[PDB]
Structure formats: C-alpha cells, structure tokens
Amino acid sequence: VLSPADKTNVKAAWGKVGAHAGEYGAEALERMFLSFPTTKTYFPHFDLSHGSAQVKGHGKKVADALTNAVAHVDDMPNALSALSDLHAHKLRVDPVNFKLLSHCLLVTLAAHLPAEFTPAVHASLDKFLASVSTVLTSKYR
Amino acid sequence: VLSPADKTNVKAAWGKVGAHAGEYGAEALERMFLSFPTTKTYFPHFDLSHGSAQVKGHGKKVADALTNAVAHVDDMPNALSALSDLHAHKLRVDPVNFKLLSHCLLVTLAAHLPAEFTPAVHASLDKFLASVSTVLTSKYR
Amino acid sequence: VHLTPEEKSAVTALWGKVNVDEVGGEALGRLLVVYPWTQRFFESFGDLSTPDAVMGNPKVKAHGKKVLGAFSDGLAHLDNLKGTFATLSELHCDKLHVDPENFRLLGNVLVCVLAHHFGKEFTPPVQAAYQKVVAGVANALAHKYH
Amino acid sequence: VHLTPEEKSAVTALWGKVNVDEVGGEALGRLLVVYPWTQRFFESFGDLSTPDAVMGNPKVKAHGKKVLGAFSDGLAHLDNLKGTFATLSELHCDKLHVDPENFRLLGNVLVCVLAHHFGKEFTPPVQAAYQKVVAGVANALAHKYH
Numbered sequence A, B: 001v002l003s004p005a006d007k008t009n010v011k012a013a014w015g016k017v018g019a020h021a022g023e024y025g026a027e028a029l030e031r032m033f034l035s036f037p038t039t040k041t042y043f044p045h046f047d048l049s050h051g052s053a054q055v056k057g058h059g060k061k062v063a064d065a066l067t068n069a070v071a072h073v074d075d076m077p078n079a080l081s082a083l084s085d086l087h088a089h090k091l092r093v094d095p096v097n098f099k100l101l102s103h104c105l106l107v108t109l110a111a112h113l114p115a116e117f118t119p120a121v122h123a124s125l126d127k128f129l130a131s132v133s134t135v136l137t138s139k140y141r
Numbered sequence C, D: 001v002h003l004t005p006e007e008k009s010a011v012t013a014l015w016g017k018v019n020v021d022e023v024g025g026e027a028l029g030r031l032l033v034v035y036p037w038t039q040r041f042f043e044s045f046g047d048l049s050t051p052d053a054v055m056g057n058p059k060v061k062a063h064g065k066k067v068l069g070a071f072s073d074g075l076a077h078l079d080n081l082k083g084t085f086a087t088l089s090e091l092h093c094d095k096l097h098v099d100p101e102n103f104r105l106l107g108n109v110l111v112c113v114l115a116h117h118f119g120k121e122f123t124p125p126v127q128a129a130y131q132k133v134v135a136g137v138a139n140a141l142a143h144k145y146h
C-alpha cells in the first residue's frame, strides 16, 4: 500500500527521468541480463548484445508502462490490466524475476538521479516497483 | 484471488484436518526447523527439542489462526488484521520465511490426507497459504 | 551436497521404495497444475486445460518418467551432481531456455509427492535430507547457465 | 568468488575510491529505512522513527562503519570468503540470531549506494561483479548457520 508520501515521492523522482525513461529502461535491462543471466531465458529471440535495437526498443516499452503506472498510481490494477493478462497468460515469466528487474531499475535511477535518490525516495520507489510486480503477477493462477 | 472452487477445496481439506489441526501445526513447525534452520533465529527463546511443549503450544496457535482464516475465507484481511499488525510491528519476521512455513504446512497435510490431497486441492491449498502469507505481511512498510 | 551419512542412508532407503514411473508423472503433472505458468514449455503436449487433462496426459506422464529417470541417476552420484548434470544443464540453458527457478519448484512439488505417498514414513528428518538433495539437484542443473 | 581477473580488478579498483565511513553509515541507514523490519535488531540504537532520524543516528552510523569495515577486509580474501567469515558466521547465528536473508538485503542496498555515489563509473559490468561479491559474502556469512 502506497502512502500519499510515497505517491508523491514516486511522481517526483519519475518526473526527473523525463525524456530519458527509454534510455533508463534500456540500461536497467542490460544491467539485469549481466547481473542475473538466468533472466536471459525469456529473451532467446532477442539480440542481447550491448546497444541492440531490440533491447533499446524493449526498454522504451517498459519505461512507457512505468510512466503510465505512475500516472495511474491510484488505479494500477486497472491501468495495467492488459499487461497483467499478457504476463499471466502468454509470457508466463516466473514471479521471482520481477524482483531482479525492480532492483536493476533502482540501481539505474540511483546512478542517474543522485540528488533525488534520497533514502525516503529509495523506500518509495522500491514499494512502487513491488506494487507494480504484484499487479503484473496477480492473474497467474 | 481464491475462486469459488479454491474455497470449496480449502474448506473441504481443512474440514478433514478437524481436531488434528494443533498436532499438524506443531509438525509443520518441526519440519520447518529441520529443513530450514535459518527459521530458528526467530525462536531463540524456545526449547526446539523434539516434543517441546513450546512448539506444541505454538503449533496450536498457528493452527487456530489458519482455522480462523478458513472460517472467514471471504474476509481474511479483517479476520487476520491483529495478526498482521503483530507480525509487521513486533515480530518483524522477514517475508521469505512465510513461504518456508507454507511449504512445510503443505508437506504435513500431504502426509496426513492422502485421499484428499489431490492435485486440485494441492493447488487450492497453495494459493490459500500464499494469501494468508500476503495478509500477514501487508503492513510491513 | 552436505548430507550426513545417516542422511544419505535415509534418502537411499526411501528411494528404494519409489516407483519412478508413477512418481515422475505425478510430480510433473502437479507442477503444471499448481504453477500453471510452467506450462509455457509444453505447448506441444496438447490439452493441459484442467487438472484431469494434465494428470492423465500421456505426454506429461512420459516426460515425467524421463525427468525422474535422470533424477534417480543423480541419486547415485550425490558426490558429483555438478558433473552428473552438466550436459543436461547446458541443454536446459542453451536449447530449452528453461529458467532454473523451475527446477526449485519441481523439487518442492516432488517433496509433497513423497509425503503424499509415504505418509508417516516421510518424517521431519527424512524431509530435511530430501530438501538438501532437491536443492543440490536444482543447483547442479543451473550451474552451466550463462 | 567465481570472479574473473577482469572482474576482480574492477571490484578492487572501485573499492579503492570508497570512503567506508560514509558508505557504511549510508548502506545500514538505507537498510533500516527501505526494509523497516530490519530495525528489530537495533532497538537499543534509539530513534529510528524517521528516515532523518535513522540517517542522523550515530549509533547507526558507527555500526555501518564496523560492518563495511569487516566487508572491506573480506575483499582481500575473495578466494576464501568462507574461512574469512567463519567466526562472524557463528556469531551472527549463535549470538545475534540474525536471519541470513538480512545479509542479502544489505548487499542489494550496498549496490544501490555504490551506484548512487559513483554514477557513471558504476557500469552494468561493474555492477555484475559487485553482485557476485555481495552474494558471495552473504553466502559466507550464512555458512555456519545450524
């Protein structure tokens, strides 16, 4: 449960990402693939090389979905219904993986938003990604 | 979410546990202590010896709480509120441990209800314990 | 795997009683039913729409027997699981693209299956030995991932 | 751990630039804030009621320096984290009763702090090497639990 402070913190931090969200999306994936190689099992059809257009394009897609979630922080289940469907019935990514991408996203944010990545904001972003993860895996079974 | 089917399955299997809930609760704890020794860090104050009265006593308590959640399967968040607060604010058990106990609870039921422990019931019971665990960990942060 | 000799004897004694064909089918079927996302790997197996469709599927039963067959062999080389499972690890990674978490889910399901079958005989300490074994196998199977 | 020469060097060189004092106090504080349940071991530290109160707490600050101190020394024994942390592993188990999962949380918090601090310099490949260290240290610290 995101508190009003959390929602604020999240909207602020994400506000600063702005036009770089796609690049950050892409960077977080690259960090995930390198740090947790088991995650690559879900992308056998991608070119996972540094700066592949598939990874870049996919980073955009993820970033965009995050944006939309911040935008509907109050209505996540609904803003992300389609994505919850996609993941539960088609992609079927094991739930453990969501924690790995979430962590790589925090690291990416930390690395690029030094002034904004305060302890309270770090706490909020973590809770936020957790909530996003919960929504995305809620129709699994 | 638990479907009507899940609910029927859980009431039915738990129905069969009946008067043995206490003993099964205690057995689940012992299996957990033996298979996942790190869980012992939470009971430094307990006599964890085989046939410990403390373990027996604790097993009943856990079993009573599960019995209560089954009785209130349509209002678990409220039926378990108090326990949710206790775990979040006093006990502060790391979330990963819930999955360990759930697993030992499933092993115990399997070992005792061969006829009822069907694939369908197994699935419903797993989803149920996951839901109880989620409620108990909901106020952590 | 750090199995005391008395843990190793206990594992081995029980395994003596298992019908690998039957347990293999039960373990694999239950995995697909309890964690339906695992069905992602078996779209060529046909109908997995209901518990009966899964549990009775001749393809699931045959595959389950194959998986537990490989596992039983692992039980005779408890000393060198990594070596034992190396080519299988490579295959699962490079050809099948199977997330190693699947190996841990199967291990847990197998433990419930053994509990289901042996009842009281599957004592707390026997379970502890099998937990070590299943983790060692999952680890061995994931060792060649990259 | 299973660190590559190139991986060993990257770790080594970034660490040389680390102010253990500051990074240690920040890592522990962030832990207490992000994962509030970890506060269960530090009741005697005082006021942990707010991020500000945690971050400002000198007891927290000094504990963080002690922890990162020990971590730092372990980087000199990357080839035997197990023997390096054996006594600390026993202490954490037998005296402090700290669930090893906490070791994992800290590790990840540590990685976020390094990224926070080094920005640009904390590249995907450098993060990968640190993830291996952090996991290796957590494993070593959990090794003597029973």
Ligand code: HEM
Binding pocket: A039, A042, A043, A058, A061, A062, A065, A066, A083, A086, A087, A091, A093, A097, A098, A099, A101, A102, A132, A133, A136
């Ligand atoms: C933070 C949580 C996540 C979000 C918001 C997210 C979002 C998305 C989006 C927006 C898409 C594209 C949908 C479309 O094509 O219309 C997608 C696809 C996909 N996602 Fe998820 N994702 C998340 C976590 C994960 C994780 C952890 C994995 C696996 C490690 C994963 C695996 C995939 C795969 C394999 C695809 C399809 C890629 C393709 O074939 O182009 N996702 N995701």
Ligand code: HEM
Binding pocket: B039, B042, B043, B058, B061, B062, B065, B066, B083, B086, B087, B091, B093, B097, B098, B099, B101, B132, B133, B136
């Ligand atoms: C679904 C799972 C769980 C249920 C239903 C449950 C339920 C309970 C209940 C009913 C109590 C007694 C509170 C009272 O005095 O009224 C309790 C206490 C406690 N629980 Fe939980 N619990 C669960 C999971 C866990 C886990 C996984 C752990 C750690 C491995 C844990 C650790 C404790 C501890 C340390 C106490 C206090 C015991 C004492 O000091 O007497 N619990 N729990």
Ligand code: HEM
Binding pocket: C038, C041, C042, C066, C067, C068, C070, C071, C088, C092, C096, C098, C102, C103, C106, C137, C141
């Ligand atoms: C104890 C762990 C496991 C063992 C010992 C094992 C063993 C095997 C063996 C011996 C084969 C046949 C190899 C070949 O075709 O050359 C195989 C194939 C396969 N395994 Fe594994 N397996 C295990 C777990 C799993 C799990 C948990 C999954 C997925 C959830 C999985 C997915 C597959 C698939 C998709 C195939 C290929 C089936 C086909 O022919 O279409 N395995 N495995």
Ligand code: HEM
Binding pocket: D038, D041, D042, D066, D067, D068, D070, D071, D088, D092, D096, D098, D102, D103, D106, D137, D141
């Ligand atoms: C990188 C992992 C860690 C390392 C290397 C480490 C190391 C240390 C060291 C060197 C001490 C000094 C005490 C003595 O020698 O008597 C200590 C104490 C302690 N540590 Fe750990 N630690 C780690 C992680 C943690 C975590 C994550 C927690 C809990 C969240 C924790 C809780 C404690 C506590 C409660 C004490 C006792 C302090 C006191 O007596 O006031 N440690 N640790």
